[PDB]
């Protein structure tokens, strides 16, 4: 009668996580919106449901929905919460899980104290792969803003589009004024996640991200990937980098020609139970 769930977050990107292997529930778009509501519902950035696999080689399937009920994720943190969750719920004893997702097979690696290592795929850089309006691929690009202000950006696609600019001080960066101008720039026809990176040294950076359609967020994981990859391409960063997001720290590893590896934390906040009827 009652749906059990777990509230989790990854550096403040917060999830409602539901075992739909030992449970069954009908969750349409409106029900997800009602559950997501911070005042009337559970309150979450995304909903993650664990489901029986469709293919014999997967241990699990999952799907991730936004607060408005659409099946979308911008930052790629949910995979880490998933890997922790199936362990915490005793759904498996394996720490190298094979999971079927909307992007194919993923094999997250759960380690110590809730940290999870994730294959984030290959970065893409060509303008038409971002998408970004530019005649030729370059190392950096000048982007024109309002009132004759310009910034230098690098572009990366991690499945979603990113533009990374380097600032001397992440605390004083004009994210509120510059972010919207980048995120909706005419040169980004599908909009873009705008990252503002301060380089502390070759192994440590700080990063604020103005996310597409959202604004500044605590923990854009693909944005951390894009910033670290960009700093490596510019010859500023080593091939393993701690990125301090607004929500906390995680690690990015990359070498040109290989995939990006992200190792990030997870947090178990509380276990809950609710009567789904009051939300359907
Ligand atoms: Cl421009």
Asked if residue 106 and residue 74 are part of one domain, the reply reads yes
Answer yes or no: do 124 and 106 share one domain.
no
Task: Name the domain count of the chain.
Answer: 2
Q: What is the CATH number of the domain that holds 23?
A: 3.10.310.10
Based on the domain organization, do 61 and 181 belong to the same domain?
A: no
Nearest of 68, 66, 60 to residue 48 by alpha carbon: 66
Whether 148 maps to a domain, the answer reads no
Domain-embedded: residue 147? no
Asked if residue 146 belongs to a domain, the reply is: no
C-alpha 187 – ligand 1 centre gap (Å) = 7
Residue 11 lies in a domain: yes
- φ, ψ for residue 192, nearest 5 deg: -160, 150
According to the annotation, is 77 in a ligand binding site?
Answer: yes
Is the link from the previous residue into 131 a cis peptide, with omega within 30 of 0?
A: yes
If asked whether residues 242 and 165 sit together in one domain, one would say yes
Residues comprising the chain, all counted? 280
What range does the domain containing 20 cover?
1-116+264-280
Residue 193 pairs with which residues in a beta bridge? Answer: 162
Please check whether residues 280 and 226 belong to one and the same domain: no
Whether 276 and 161 map to the same domain: the answer is no
Q: Distance between CA atoms of 7 and 74, rounded to whole angstroms?
A: 19
* Contact assessment for residue 208 and residue 195, using Cβ atoms and an 8 Å cutoff: yes
Residue 160 in marked binding region: yes
Distance 186 CA to ligand 1 centre (A): 8
Same domain for 222 and 100, yes or no, is no
221 assigned binding-site residue: yes
Same domain, 164 and 111: no
* E strand spans, the chain: 3-10, 13-19, 46-51, 60-66, 99-101, 104-106, 109-110, 116-119, 141-144, 150-157, 161-166, 193-201, 204-211, 215-217, 240-245, 248-253, 261-264, 267-274
Q: How far is the CA of 194 from the centre of ligand 1 (A)?
A: 15
What are the residues whose beta carbons fall under 8 Å from the beta carbon of 168, sequence distance 6 or more? 198
Are 228 and 279 in the same domain? no
> Catalytic residues, which ones?
75, 220
Q: Is 159 helix (H, G, I), strand (E, B) or coil?
A: coil
Whether residue 99 sits in one domain with residue 159: no
Task: Choose among 68, 79, 58: nearest CA to 159.
Answer: 79
Contacts of 46 (CB under 8 A, 6+ apart): 13, 14, 15, 16, 64, 65, 66, 67, 73, 78
Structure's resolution in angstroms: 1.9
For 35, phi then psi, to 5°, come to -65, -35
Residue 35 lies in a domain: yes
From residue 227, alpha-carbon distances to 2, 88, 246 in Å are 43, 32, 14
């Amino acid at each position: 009668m009652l749906l059990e769930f777990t509230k989790m977050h990854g550096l403040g990107n917060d999830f409602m996580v539901v075992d739909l292997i030992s449970q069954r529930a009908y969750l349409d778009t409106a029900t997800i919106q009602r559950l997501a509501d911070r005042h009337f519902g559970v309150g979450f950035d995304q909903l993650l449901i664990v489901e029986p696999p469709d293919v014999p080689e997967a241990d699990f399937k999952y799907r991730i929905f936004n607060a408005d009920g659409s099946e979308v994720e911008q930052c790629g943190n949910g995979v880490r919460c998933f890997a922790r969750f199936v362990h915490e719920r005793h759904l498996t004893n394996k720490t190298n899980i094979t999971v079927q997702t909307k992007a194919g097979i993923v094999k997250p690696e759960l380690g110590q104290n809730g940290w999870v290592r994730v294959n984030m795929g290959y970065p893409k850089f060509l303008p038409n792969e971002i998408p970004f309006v530019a005649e030729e691929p370059e190392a950096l690009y000048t982007l024109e803003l309002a009132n004759d202000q310009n910034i230098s950006i690098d572009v990366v696609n991690m499945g979603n589009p990113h533009a990374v600019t380097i600032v001397p001080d992440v605390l004083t960066a004009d994210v509120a004024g510059i972010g919207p101008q980048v995120e909706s720039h005419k040169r980004f026809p599908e909009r873009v996640n705008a990252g503002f990176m301060q380089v502390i040294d070759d192994k440590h950076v700080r990063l604020r991200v103005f996310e597409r359609g959202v604004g500044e967020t605590l923990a854009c994981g693909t944005g951390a990937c894009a910033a670290a990859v960009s700093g490596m391409r510019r010859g500023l960063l080593a091939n393993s980098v701690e990125v301090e997001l607004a929500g906390g720290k995680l690690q990015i590893e990359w070498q040109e020609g290989d995939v990006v590896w992200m190792t990030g934390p997870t947090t178990h906040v509380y276990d809950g139970r609710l009567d789904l009827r009051y939300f359907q």
